[PDB]
Design a protein around this ligand. Structure first.
Ligand code: HEM
Ligand code: HEM
Ligand code: HEM
Ligand code: MG
Ligand code: MG
Ligand code: MG
Ligand code: MG
Ligand code: MG
Ligand code: MG
Ligand code: MG
Ligand code: ZN
Ligand code: ZN
Ligand code: ZN
Ligand code: ZN
Ligand code: ZN
Ligand code: ZN
Ligand code: ZN
Ligand code: ZN
Ligand code: ZN
Ligand code: ZN
Ligand code: ZN
Ligand code: ZN
Ligand code: ZN
Ligand code: ZN
Lengths: 161, 161, 161, 161, 161, 161, 161
């Protein structure tokens, strides 16, 4: 099938977001592991795999629509130097996803591509959950304190890479 | 620990190659799936996961050596538009790996970092096997003919993405 | 026990034939593997193991007869450069086995060494089976054509060594 | 087999380190247990057993090379009086192992004793990992604070020797 | 891939030595069986199979490097006529392997073929182990006496081929 | 049998001390439960049961020796109103057990009642263990701080009676 | 708890013996393995582990009594060059343990430390049993003769390190 050019442009920009999120989350999780925050690392790693799945889903749809998935381009990674900065870095990307997909979904349905819209509706709900998780962590750090919060991210006894 | 700066530059160069290989192979697998070569696509996808593992292994070592893993850089993807071109594209990056790692391993041992050298020795063996597979497929296409080779890459009956 | 000196000379000639057949078949199977004909390679390797078993059985009898097994001597290997040449090379040694064992068996039963004769009767029937297999493959290549026959010797998707 | 005299001297020096690390680690873990840090004690004990295993592996190779394993000599134990001191003491012998084995490995490979080299490459990798665990715990204590870190090393309810 | 011409020459000489050791060990084991040393025979036969596996591993590497495995040449068998002579025979060829592979591994690494070096490092370790076993048996025969040693090589009651 | 009058006096004083420790420990555990220190409560309750078993063992021996177990007398309970006070309370009575049983065991043996001595030796060992636990907890509260220590005595989320 | 200073000195002296017996026994078992006496080596290794267990038990008690376990000091190893010499060497340290612990036990009971006494009574019983095993083997060698005894310490077929 031939996809609509604007829908393909949109799926491709979202693809770039996902490939960027894969790297950002993956690296965060590895850095978290290396700092001793092994319990938190497991969770960030899983976020990474969800992004891998998003990238795949989008690639499929781009191919089905006879487009060219862009695996060449990445956005700028935000590599945080502390737990708080890492949550904010990943929060920043998730909110860029909303800014895009909120009008994006509406644009797909105007173009009468319900299937693309539904696919992006599913990704949006997944990213809204990530946002929810991240925002709650930053809120928890505020309530517990950085030290105390970080203590909930290590195993007993603390472990390593 | 502090890694030797030339060793880390080499580990990061290799990391970039792995990240590039992940994208190249994964896209190739998806494209093979969409063309109906679903049997071949399963194998190419597995090659992609092996690169993901290489990236991870290298990332760990760079961190242990207190370096900064570069997840920002990719090399240029070669996206082939036929099966032969895809094998040739993937073969071209595996050969780049050899050119890098062959003197690389010797440099690591000279710098007295035998652990990073063994890590790269293991990746090198893995990539030599990928080379062997790819060169054998290009040979087989010559022996069988493109059509008949391709016919061994579809299921019974042929399927789709 | 003292074996008859002509029977021991015969048993040793055949052992040399088996030791040669072990190498020829084994190397053919490894070659086939490296060409991508992995399915065919499994069958040639098994013919190798059959020859290994013949060599052992003969070895045993030579020893029981207080002879010296010759493990030093090999005949000339025919190392084929194509599937057809490999079948022909392997067929050529099986035919040499026939020329030897057909009068050989009669000779053993003349020397009143029935047990060695039965030993060789068993080997002869196994080699007649290999001849049958080989002759049928050469016929099949003529019926199917080289490429099409070879395509039945790869897996789906084609693999390698 | 007669081993190279310099290889043997190196293997024996490393043996002495292992025997020392056994006692230091074992005693550390026992002290940790008596302080109530029973969860951390299990990890420290395990490090002990890893050292016992290195001692054994080296002993075997010294014997295979007709040398005399030195079970008489120990280095100076550093017995720390605090968790931080203990990590620092154990870190200090692991760094001594690096300074020995990094040129040690190159020396074995020069003497053309690749088997001894490989054995020490494996010990090196193991000790690099202890170093990584140790430096991560010292960093964690700085991020969490001594009291909070310590509370991750007791069970719920806190236990004892 | 095209292997280095000098490394292929080495791998091929190693292969001749393995093909020779298969024959030597195998025949020794059969001879041991016919003398009644059936328990010892089991162990010698296994050594034979280990040599078969080395021959295989080397063949695969020669083929991956586009070389021609030499299945035609054998070295001179040393066929011992007593247990002591057999251990000496077999020890003789294990030592020739060392003479060859100690500088060989160094040469592979200089040629920047780490993978072939690693393959030979593995074989070297395996042969060092054979040497250790063989040297131990010859020393045990000295300690126990030939009769008494031999008595530990038969079953209860002694069996036969 | 008729026990020695002096050993019976000792066994009976020991019995009073056990009956007292049952009550003290049991009440402490219940109090700990009502404060929310439910994980700590489990351990204190078990200490109570151990004291019940000591009381039983002593009763049986007094009866076998035709004595009159004194189930009427208690010593003064020390009921602490904080965790620290409770450990101190319980430690106080374990130390009184030592004061009594150290010369007691010596006295049984002088009276030639080895069996009663052995029985008390077993109790002494059990109490030394209680002392070790208690002393460790008081030292841990010093290291961690009262709040932090107490936090290791609650479940997640904190529970109640 | 504060242990009696003389009890602590005795426990530490015995600790030194154990640490020495660990090394002597372990090395003996490794040497026995390299000589081909692999069946006897398994028994000698086990004695080693028993010594490790004594070392641990003593360490625990020294710690419970707020002493400093001495992991720095070793006595002189007697490394025997023959099976008979090894039994004699190991017998010589077990007899040193008797000479220490026989008055040691009486001294603990005088200091009214019955728990330490019991712990050393248990070690004494264990070492009395090693002494019995050791003196029985020396007697057996005299009854069977060295060669014949030795042949009961190898497997069938004789093995190696
Ligand atoms: C092109 C971007 C990528 C795509 C589309 C992708 C896709 C996937 C998919 C579909 C899986 C299996 C998911 C599952 O069923 O659990 C996966 C697994 C994995 N990926 Fe990726 N990935 C990408 C990049 C990366 C990168 C950059 C890394 C690390 C540097 C990485 C590391 C891994 C690891 C460690 C696993 C699982 C390990 C295994 O079982 O092999 N991936 N990926
Ligand atoms: C050309 C050199 C040879 C190669 C590369 C070779 C390789 C092998 C391999 C890969 C196996 C499978 C089992 C294993 O290796 O663990 C095997 C089995 C065997 N080989 Fe060989 N071999 C060779 C020559 C010989 C010779 C000269 C004999 C003498 C009889 C022999 C006797 C056997 C026997 C009895 C078995 C097991 C029987 C069976 O599995 O059916 N081999 N060989
Ligand atoms: C002298 C050098 C030593 C060597 C070569 C040595 C070797 C070993 C080996 C090979 C094991 C079993 C391996 C395993 O289960 O993972 C072991 C276990 C043990 N070792 Fe050592 N060890 C040595 C010294 C010590 C010392 C000084 C202590 C101090 C008490 C010690 C305490 C233990 C304990 C508690 C175990 C495990 C107990 C068991 O499994 O029965 N070892 N040792
Ligand atoms: Mg399509
Ligand atoms: Mg670090
Ligand atoms: Mg015979
Ligand atoms: Mg030796
Ligand atoms: Mg090839
Ligand atoms: Mg009564
Ligand atoms: Mg204490
Ligand atoms: Zn996503
Ligand atoms: Zn997301
Ligand atoms: Zn790779
Ligand atoms: Zn690759
Ligand atoms: Zn045959
Ligand atoms: Zn045949
Ligand atoms: Zn170590
Ligand atoms: Zn270590
Ligand atoms: Zn070999
Ligand atoms: Zn060998
Ligand atoms: Zn009690
Ligand atoms: Zn108590
Ligand atoms: Zn002991
Ligand atoms: Zn002992």
């Amino acid at each position: 099938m031939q996809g609509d050019p604007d829908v393909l442009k949109l799926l491709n920009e979202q693809l770039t977001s996902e490939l960027t999120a894969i790297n950002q989350y993956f690296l965060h999780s590895k850095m978290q592991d290396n700092w001793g925050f092994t319990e938190l690392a497991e969770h960030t790693r899983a976020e990474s795999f969800e992004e891998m799945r998003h990238a795949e889903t989008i690639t499929d749809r781009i191919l089905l629509l006879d487009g060219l998935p862009n695996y060449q381009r990445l956005f700028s990674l935000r590599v945080g130097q502390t737990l708080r900065e890492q949550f904010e870095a990943d929060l920043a990307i998730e909110y860029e996803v909303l800014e895009r997909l909120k009008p994006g979904i509406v644009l797909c349905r105007e173009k009468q591509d319900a299937t693309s819209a539904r696919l992006l509706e599913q990704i949006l709900a997944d990213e809204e959950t990530h946002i929810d998780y991240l925002e709650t962590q930053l809120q928890l750090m505020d309530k517990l304190g950085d030290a105390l919060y970080a203590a909930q991210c290590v195993s007993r006894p603390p472990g390593s890479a």
